[PDB]
Curated annotation (Swiss-Prot), chain B:
It comes from Mus musculus (Mouse). Residues 3-96 form the Cadherin domain. Changing V5A: Decreased calcium-dependent cell-cell adhesion. Ca(2+) 2 binds at E13, E65, D96. This is Cadherin-2.
Length: 102, 96
């Protein structure tokens, strides 16, 4: 559809994993027509604290890399991107919210 | 329009509820509706959506026997009833 938000993901606090732990798959149906590469930006991804969340560039699978405590940041606001071979975005970026729950 | 895909919703089989039980919120002023088997097509009224918030809920415990996976479509219209964006597919798996 033309523009819908991805439902927030709830992640239990101080999970035992193991890590990396897959959370959800974020991708576009356009990837069945064009070669697309997925990326994630925002605090937790490429902004502090870095490397907590990663996304598989081909599948769109989003994963957590370590246990998370709620004291410092209890909610992360990321943005997933879908880009063609020249790097042009083929979808408007989409917001991803990860809530750390106790 | 956009073609981002909404992640499948996994719902435990024969849940205790209480009911209605909140599942997920699907949103884009606007009014939301859901169509398909389980919503407005048989078995009707199992899944319902709040027209303002987009909150999708389930109304009773579900057994996997008859239907284990539902395919619905969420719709968004302006206050005049005009569709403002392409409908979006929603998938619900009843997990045991
Ligand atoms: O376990 U504590 O925020």
């Amino acid at each position: 559809g033309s523009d819908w938000v991805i439902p927030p993901i709830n992640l239990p606090e101080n999970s035992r994993g193991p890590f990396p732990q897959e959370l959800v798959r974020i991708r576009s149906g356009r990837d069945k027509n064009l070669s697309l590469r997925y990326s994630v930006t925002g605090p937790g991804a490429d902004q502090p604290p870095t490397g907590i969340f990663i996304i598989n560039p081909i599948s769109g699978q989003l994963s957590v890399t370590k246990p998370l405590d709620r004291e410092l940041i209890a909610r992360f606001h990321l943005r997933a991107h879908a880009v063609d071979i020249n790097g042009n975005q083929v979808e408007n970026p989409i917001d991803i919210v990860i809530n750390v729950i106790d």
